[PDB]
Amino acid sequence: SFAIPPANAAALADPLPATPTPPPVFEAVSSAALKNVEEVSTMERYEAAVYEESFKKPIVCLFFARFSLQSKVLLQPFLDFAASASNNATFFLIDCDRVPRAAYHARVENVPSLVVMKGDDAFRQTITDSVGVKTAGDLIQEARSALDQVLRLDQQEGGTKLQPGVSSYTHHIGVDNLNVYRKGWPVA
Amino acid sequence: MLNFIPKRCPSVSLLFGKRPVQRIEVGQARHQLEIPVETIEKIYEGVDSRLEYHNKDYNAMKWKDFM
Amino acid sequence: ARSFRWMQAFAAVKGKPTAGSCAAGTAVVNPEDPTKVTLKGRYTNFSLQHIWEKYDYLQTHLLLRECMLSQVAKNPRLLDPEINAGLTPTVF
Amino acid sequence: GKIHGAVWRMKHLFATNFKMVGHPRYAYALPKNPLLQ
Amino acid sequence: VSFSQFFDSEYFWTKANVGPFFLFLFTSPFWY
Amino acid sequence: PLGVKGRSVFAGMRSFIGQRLGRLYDSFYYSQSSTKYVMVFLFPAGIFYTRFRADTKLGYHVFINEEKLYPDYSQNYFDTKWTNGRKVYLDDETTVE
Amino acid sequence: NPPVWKVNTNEWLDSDQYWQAFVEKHHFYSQYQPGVVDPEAPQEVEAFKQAWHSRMGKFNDRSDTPMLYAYMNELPSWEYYDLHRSAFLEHMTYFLVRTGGDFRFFPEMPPWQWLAHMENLRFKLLSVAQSRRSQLQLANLHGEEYTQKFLQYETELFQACAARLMGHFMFLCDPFIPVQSAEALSAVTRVDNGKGKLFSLGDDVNALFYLPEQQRRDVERPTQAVQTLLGHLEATGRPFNPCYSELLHVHAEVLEERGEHWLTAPGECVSQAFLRRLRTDDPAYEVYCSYFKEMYERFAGAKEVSMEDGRKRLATIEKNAQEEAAAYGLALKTMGSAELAHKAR
Amino acid sequence: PSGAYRLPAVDYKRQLSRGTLVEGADFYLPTAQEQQRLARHFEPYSEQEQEERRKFRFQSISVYLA
Amino acid sequence: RPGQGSNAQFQTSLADKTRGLLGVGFLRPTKMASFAATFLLNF
Ligand SMILES: CCCCCCCCCCCCCCCCCC(=O)OC[C@H](COP(=O)([O-])OCC(O)COP(=O)([O-])OC[C@@H](COC(=O)CCCCCCCCCCCCCCCCC)OC(=O)CCCCCCCCCCCCCCCCC)OC(=O)CCCCCCCCCCCCCCCCC
Ligand SMILES: CCCCCCCCCCCCCCCCCC(=O)OC[C@H](COP(=O)([O-])OCC(O)COP(=O)([O-])OC[C@@H](COC(=O)CCCCCCCCCCCCCCCCC)OC(=O)CCCCCCCCCCCCCCCCC)OC(=O)CCCCCCCCCCCCCCCCC
Ligand SMILES: CCCCCCCCCCCCCCCCCC(=O)OC[C@H](COP(=O)([O-])OCC(O)COP(=O)([O-])OC[C@@H](COC(=O)CCCCCCCCCCCCCCCCC)OC(=O)CCCCCCCCCCCCCCCCC)OC(=O)CCCCCCCCCCCCCCCCC
Ligand SMILES: CCCCCCCCCCCCCCCCCC(=O)OC[C@H](COP(=O)([O-])OCC[N+](C)(C)C)OC(=O)CCCCCCCCCCCCCCCCC
Ligand SMILES: CCCCCCCCCCCCCCCCCC(=O)OC[C@H](COP(=O)([O-])OCC[N+](C)(C)C)OC(=O)CCCCCCCCCCCCCCCCC
Ligand SMILES: CCCCCCCCCCCCO[C@@H]1O[C@H](CO)[C@@H](O[C@H]2O[C@H](CO)[C@@H](O)[C@H](O)[C@H]2O)[C@H](O)[C@H]1O
Ligand SMILES: CCCCCCCCCCCCO[C@@H]1O[C@H](CO)[C@@H](O[C@H]2O[C@H](CO)[C@@H](O)[C@H](O)[C@H]2O)[C@H](O)[C@H]1O
């Protein structure tokens, strides 16, 4: 016998509330849209991307969360990589607490996470640091390599050789059972 | 109600349109109600004659009109 | 007393429930369009709530520790009140 | 036989209600009553 | 009809008649 | 939309076999060391050997008339003593000697 | 109409096109649906759900009548942490410290690097504790409850300290540095070598803040922080116990494992980092937000005060501060827990 | 392993904690024509479909026999 | 680097890495035999 209580007002509350901002003295420290990416706020937009744009040309999605400092460190170089390679791919910026169904879809278990996607399963490569040894430059190098690889493979063999796999018949229902509604199956 | 419209032929419903009115008893108290035969005849434009049930004495309406 | 204003404020919110004792999300189907379904809540890759409900405080506790360390790297004399009060384990 | 029993009960319990034009789980799809306001 | 354009996926799954092919495939042990 | 132009059903078969083999490797990796090696190599191998030997070779039940003619099996291990009725598998070229 | 019980069933269903679809849905597309008039009804739905949960539980759960729990030598994550509560705690504190993160991102299986580091730290702690016990405990002649008590008392203590400091806006003030004595003033001025400024707030704030120069507004490494703290404590003659000191050292080590940016981003302050890493489900979220709002709007308008104007002020600040610290012991009996009270007594 | 050929599902406990689990529909309805029948209320079946269905009001004992 | 402090502690002997290659405390042929015995006895 296993159960979890359904939810609480705290859990269902806004995960991303506003916090106070300091005056321009705390900012003075020793260490002191974006026209190339798309911030995603809605699973509708995420699905549109994954099921149309990721079939046209590849996408690169950064899944972050506010509490993480590695995300803050990785944001700017990710924007530079986007400004470099937006001609060949699309670039998306996702918050896990705002759009969790996108995080469940991409099978991300730690943050920050890069996800290169093409055909929604023809090429899915997840780049992250589960240990805590890599750095932002290492992650971006791995992302560049993966993007080059997927581009080469899409050019390979007359555009084919990149066909979707298990999502052809699973529809990510074992990952997220709520896709039965999308598919129109009953739940009675 | 059911989608069972009685055939207005005299072999089934004797004396259907001999007079310009129909009558019915309604409910447990069996209240009387009189209805014009033209209001009733409007149904037999939606009636479908391929379908015949209950000793071939009742036809069926089209589902659009019935619903 | 007015210095312990904040102690009173903390003691006010003591046993208020959190997301660590329950599921982090819930589904709501649009009744007019049952194909449309929304997930209200947060992310979670966690299912040991029946254990974590007892140690829920550790996250903010360790945050407070890291911040006390940051303050003490500049001034270690902020704890002397508690040391003199005898709360910490110390061998005078 | 199971199907026969199911339909035989459906007849008696649905065909004379005036409240079940269809199933209540799909009443969202019906048109709206002009008499309610 | 050519071997290649027959065994192309689109023609194989949309326009072709794969009945004889799959019947031969099922009855392979009989022929062998 | 079934099938894609320029792609072959044989290429799709190769894709599928690759998927299946990769999944099998993943499931074997994320499994118990105590059980998987046995259940995947040692029981299949023993069953294969036994079934192949029975279905292919031909064997004989051997008896001996007298105990004085029994062999000396004291030294060799796992069989210290002769027992009559032993099943013995031989090759077709075997002679009585 | 005729009486519906006189009417033939198949004729009724041929007349009706809607309930045809209802029958096909449950008895043509399935073979196991019950022969009831309404299979879509809430009683049936909830019965199906409860049956689903009971079936899955009976199959998967660890029980006295186990179906699937069998031939278990290497356990999975959930069962491992359910049976070994000691390891769930250790594996979880390491995760939050090695990666400043939320419990919601707790990994299914940890890395072998993390496990090995845990074993090394266990070596360190058990060595120190065993040698201490060998020395002192013998010349004289349930761990779960103890750990729970220790952690509860510790979080209560740190909460009380944070409240005490927020009382005078000294809790998380950086790049400012609070000062309640001329000795501390000199000590923290030695950081910037006399450079920088000093700021004051009038007679409700019982301390004076110091701003170093922007090049020296950095945060220090946690090992350096611990060394500074301990050195000050031994200079004053109040050393911690060795077990606690080792605990601090291991905490500093796992914090060093984070790397260059261990607490703050480049253009970030410690208050912003705290509010960033703060759990949003936390009850004290609004309390901390209130405090930081007030602190920001006060420090925006804080006045500048030069050096010698403060020392004469720092004397009376020391006086009323020691008076408040004396009052603190009684104030803990007001609302602090019985543990804090008995430890103050 | 890389992770490309990972298990294409998530455990039911984790789904239950995520608020994602669905229990129902041992059966399914493949086509939207078949899904929206009980919601249309006016054409659950097209006319062609209706006349095709009218051929199977009874089982065929003749075909069974043959 | 972040993890260099931990990854410096991981330096092994030749005999250590031979023992790991062979999997002394991680294969457990006695456990394999116990599993086989229990599995056959469960028939
Ligand atoms: C894994 C999950 C589970 C998935 C299951 C999915 C469901 C589908 C499975 C198929 C369903 C049928 C299975 C029934 C149970 C099987 C037992 C059985 O019925 O047969 C017993 C019977 C033997 O039993 P017996 O007791 O000795 O009786 C002897 C009598 O003479 C008996 O002989 P007989 O005189 O009575 O004559 C009849 C006999 C005669 O049998 C024969 O003659 C066999 C030789 C026929 C050759 C015909 C020429 C074909 C040319 C090659 C075609 C390409 C094949 C490529 C490989 C297979 C592709 C599927 O055959 C039969 O009885 C009918 C069996 C064949 C029916 C057709 C089924 C074909 C398989 C279709 C599978 C499709 C989906 C699979 C799912 C894939 C996973 C996604 O079958 C056989 O004769 C042997 C089977 C063939 C083995 C040859 C292959 C060995 C592999 C090594 C060869 C080297 C090359 C390959 C190396 C690998 C490459 C890297
Ligand atoms: C020499 C040493 C010997 C030792 C072995 C050495 C290694 C050799 C190779 C492996 C041999 C062991 C094979 C064991 C496989 C079965 C049980 C198992 O262990 O799986 C655990 C393993 C892990 O399970 P899991 O982690 O708990 O769950 C993850 C899912 O499986 C993950 O699945 P998913 O989500 O990625 O995808 C869903 C999956 C579902 O897999 C499952 O999870 C359940 C599979 C159900 C198995 C039982 C089905 C039996 C049904 C009875 C058949 C009645 C047929 C009626 C026919 C009448 C028609 C006339 O779909 C499939 O791929 C299954 C396809 C096969 C089912 C065919 C059923 C008939 C439908 C026909 C469809 C048309 C053909 C395929 C079309 C595709 C394009 C070509 O399973 C898998 O990794 C995938 C399923 C395995 C499929 C078969 C793979 C090929 C095996 C080839 C056998 C040939 C052996 C002969 C060698 C030659 C000797 C001479
Ligand atoms: C030799 C083998 C036999 C032994 C093995 C037995 C295995 C089967 C076991 C079956 C057990 C069921 C038990 C009986 C059920 C009775 C209820 C019933 O059948 O409902 C009426 C039902 C009437 O159906 P209906 O609702 O009026 O619908 C008909 C439509 O109106 C007509 O229009 P339509 O549009 O629907 O279609 C027209 C036409 C044809 O469809 C078309 O539209 C045109 C296309 C037709 C061409 C296709 C050809 C068929 C296949 C090839 C045949 C040629 C030879 C192959 C050549 C090889 C290549 C060269 O329809 C048909 O031909 C119907 C096909 C018959 C299918 C039988 C249903 C059994 C389902 C399960 C079979 C299991 C097999 C496993 C599946 C996988 C196998 C790999 O009866 C039948 O049609 C089935 C006759 C079954 C007779 C089997 C005899 C068993 C006797 C059991 C009685 C109790 C035994 C006690 C003994 C003691 C004696 C006193
Ligand atoms: C011979 C006796 C068989 C009787 C028992 C089996 C049932 C009888 C029915 C035939 C069985 C086969 C049905 C196949 C259904 C799959 C169709 C399909 O499209 O799958 C996706 C594959 C993969 O497609 P794809 O991914 O490359 O590209 C398309 C992508 N989508 C789907 C998204 C559009 O399609 C194919 O390319 C053709 C596969 C079917 C042909 C292979 C038949 C398999 C049966 C043999 C099993 C062993 C395989 C190894 C054979 C080696 C030969 C030397
Ligand atoms: C008419 C016929 C009708 C019947 C249909 C006939 C066909 C289908 C019949 C199948 C039924 C039986 C299927 C049972 C399969 C049991 C096999 C099994 O699971 O193994 C036990 C292991 C044991 O795993 P486990 O012990 O961790 O967990 C098992 C279950 N519990 C938890 C309860 C103990 O299962 C696996 O994880 C591995 C299975 C996948 C691999 C299958 C073998 C092939 C391996 C090839 C790759 C080898 C890589 C080598 C690399 C070496 C370097 C690392
Ligand atoms: C409704 C859709 C139907 C689609 C599927 C159609 C299936 C077509 C295959 C069935 C046709 C016969 O199938 C075939 O029959 C013969 C005899 O029965 C079998 O042949 C086997 O038995 C016969 C008789 O002893 C032997 O001569 C032969 O050597 C042996 O291989 C084949 O093993 C089988 O493959
Ligand atoms: C991937 C391809 C796999 C396809 C499967 C091919 C079969 C694999 C097993 C081959 C094993 C061959 O091993 C060989 O088998 C035969 C038959 O048992 C034995 O041979 C024995 O029986 C045969 C038949 O009478 C005779 O040669 C002789 O009586 C005797 O030597 C050999 O002593 C053995 O060396």
Side-chain angles (χ1 to χ4, degrees), chain F residues 34-60:
Chain F
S34 296
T35 71
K36 71 195 184 190
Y37 293 109
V38 170
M39 187 62 71
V40 174
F41 293 109
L42 310 187
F43 286 168
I47 291 157
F48 194 103
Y49 179 72
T50 297
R51 183 64 179 227
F52 197 80
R53 182 180 64 172
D55 287 7
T56 300
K57 292 184 112 191
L58 74 171
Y60 310 87

Side-chain angles (χ1 to χ4, degrees), chain A residues 1-2 10 14-15 17 19-23 26 28-32 66-67 69 72-73 97 109 111 130-132 188, chain G residues 61 78 98 100-102 104-105 113-114 174-176 214-215 217-218 261 264-266 268 272 276-277 280-281 285 296:
Chain A
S1 179
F2 174 82
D14 183 45
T19 59
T21 175
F26 294 87
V29 193
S30 65
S31 44
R66 71 187 290 153
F67 61 86
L69 168 59
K72 286 187 73 54
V73 170
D97 277 334
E109 293 84 2
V111 290
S130 315
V131 180
Chain G
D61 289 348
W78 199 96
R98 173 57 174 286
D102 192 301
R104 295 174 295 123
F105 292 79
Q113 299 93 331
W114 294 15
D174 288 329
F176 299 89
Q214 197 175 341
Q215 55 158 16
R217 286 179 191 172
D218 63 80
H261 315 295
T264 54
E268 198 177 1
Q272 286 287 271
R276 186 196 74 212
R277 268 195 67 196
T280 304
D281 296 323
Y285 189 75
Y296 291 144

Side-chain angles (χ1 to χ4, degrees), chain H residues 4 12 17 22 30 33-34 37 45 47-48 50 58 63-64:
Chain H
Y12 78 102
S17 86
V22 180
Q33 180 67 12
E34 298 163 352
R37 284 203 204 288
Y45 301 93
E47 302 298 82
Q48 203 274 340
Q50 278 182 22
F58 315 94
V63 163
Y64 179 23

Side-chain angles (χ1 to χ4, degrees), chain C residues 56 65-66 74 78 87, chain G residues 153-154 164 218 277 279:
Chain C
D56 213 339
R65 298 202 68 153
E66 204 176 343
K74 316 306 195 194
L78 319 178
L87 314 173
Chain G
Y153 154 78
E154 207 169 358
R164 182 182 69 72
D218 63 80
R277 268 195 67 196
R279 190 179 66 182

Side-chain angles (χ1 to χ4, degrees), chain G residues 56-188 190-300:
Chain G
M56 296 296 280
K58 191 175 160 49
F59 183 67
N60 280 294
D61 289 348
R62 165 169 49 72
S63 176
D64 306 337
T65 44
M67 283 202 174
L68 186 73
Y69 199 88
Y71 314 107
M72 278 285 140
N73 313 126
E74 313 191 339
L75 302 166
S77 183
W78 199 96
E79 302 287 2
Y80 183 92
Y81 293 132
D82 182 26
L83 297 172
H84 310 291
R85 311 305 194 79
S86 172
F88 171 73
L89 191 70
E90 293 148 25
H91 294 185
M92 176 50 112
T93 62
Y94 193 92
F95 163 71
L96 299 166
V97 177
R98 173 57 174 286
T99 76
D102 192 301
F103 70 103
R104 295 174 295 123
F105 292 79
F106 182 59
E108 202 166 48
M109 55 180 283
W112 63 270
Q113 299 93 331
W114 294 15
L115 288 162
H117 197 210
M118 284 177 220
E119 299 316 318
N120 297 338
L121 301 165
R122 178 173 283 109
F123 182 30
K124 204 178 300 319
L125 270 76
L126 267 60
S127 85
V128 164
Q130 181 72 317
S131 67
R132 181 177 175 80
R133 156 164 64 175
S134 83
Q135 281 307 324
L136 61 91
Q137 185 251 336
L138 311 183
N140 307 323
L141 309 173
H142 311 267
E144 185 151 24
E145 297 157 27
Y146 279 60
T147 309
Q148 206 79 19
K149 285 192 298 202
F150 180 67
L151 298 167
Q152 283 164 317
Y153 154 78
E154 207 169 358
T155 183
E156 278 281 79
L157 169 57
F158 278 67
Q159 196 73 274
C161 297
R164 182 182 69 72
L165 294 171
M166 283 197 299
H168 295 305
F169 300 94
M170 302 151 60
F171 169 51
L172 281 171
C173 56
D174 288 329
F176 299 89
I177 299 163
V179 185
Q180 297 205 296
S181 308
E183 302 101 306
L185 180 135
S186 63
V188 305
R190 184 148 73 265
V191 172
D192 211 346
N193 218 334
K195 300 291 103 179
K197 323 295 172 61
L198 191 157
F199 282 66
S200 182
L201 291 168
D203 290 348
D204 56 298
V205 177
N206 195 0
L208 303 180
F209 312 108
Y210 177 82
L211 282 176
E213 180 166 310
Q214 197 175 341
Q215 55 158 16
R216 292 300 318 281
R217 286 179 191 172
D218 63 80
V219 289
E220 202 168 9
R221 309 300 301 189
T223 55
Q224 269 286 11
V226 172
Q227 284 161 6
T228 293
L229 178 53
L230 295 173
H232 175 261
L233 287 185
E234 285 108 22
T236 312
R238 294 174 301 184
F240 275 122
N241 298 72
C243 308
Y244 208 87
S245 301
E246 292 292 328
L247 201 70
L248 303 199
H249 285 312
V250 57
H251 190 88
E253 171 160 43
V254 189
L255 288 171
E256 282 278 31
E257 293 296 338
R258 295 195 194 171
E260 188 72 7
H261 315 295
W262 71 276
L263 183 61
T264 54
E268 198 177 1
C269 82
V270 171
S271 53
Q272 286 287 271
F274 179 84
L275 293 162
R276 186 196 74 212
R277 268 195 67 196
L278 177 57
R279 190 179 66 182
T280 304
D281 296 323
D282 201 35
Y285 189 75
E286 294 88 351
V287 171
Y288 287 114
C289 283
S290 299
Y291 165 78
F292 281 112
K293 211 183 182 193
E294 187 169 23
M295 197 192 77
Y296 291 144
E297 60 86 9
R298 290 286 299 275
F299 268 88

Side-chain angles (χ1 to χ4, degrees), chain E residues 9-25:
Chain E
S9 292
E10 191 175 9
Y11 187 81
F12 194 80
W13 292 120
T14 64
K15 292 167 276 173
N17 181 20
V18 293
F21 174 68
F22 274 103
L23 284 166
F24 179 80
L25 199 72

Side-chain angles (χ1 to χ4, degrees), chain C residues 6-85:
Chain C
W6 293 116
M7 294 174 55
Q8 299 181 349
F10 280 127
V13 295
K14 180 56 153 287
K16 186 172 71 64
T18 57
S21 58
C22 63
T26 192
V28 289
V29 193
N30 183 15
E32 294 176 353
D33 192 358
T35 291
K36 302 288 171 79
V37 57
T38 304
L39 183 65
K40 308 295 290 188
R42 295 155 158 70
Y43 174 95
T44 193
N45 211 61
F46 187 71
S47 50
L48 299 147
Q49 289 85 6
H50 72 295
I51 305 160
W52 178 253
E53 72 203 338
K54 294 159 203 319
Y55 308 99
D56 213 339
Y57 49 76
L58 284 185
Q59 200 175 306
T60 188
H61 172 39
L62 299 164
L63 185 62
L64 285 167
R65 298 202 68 153
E66 204 176 343
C67 279
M68 191 194 70
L69 286 182
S70 76
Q71 289 294 113
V72 160
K74 316 306 195 194
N75 191 12
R77 280 172 213 75
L78 319 178
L79 275 67
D80 293 332
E82 289 81 12
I83 310 308
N84 302 320

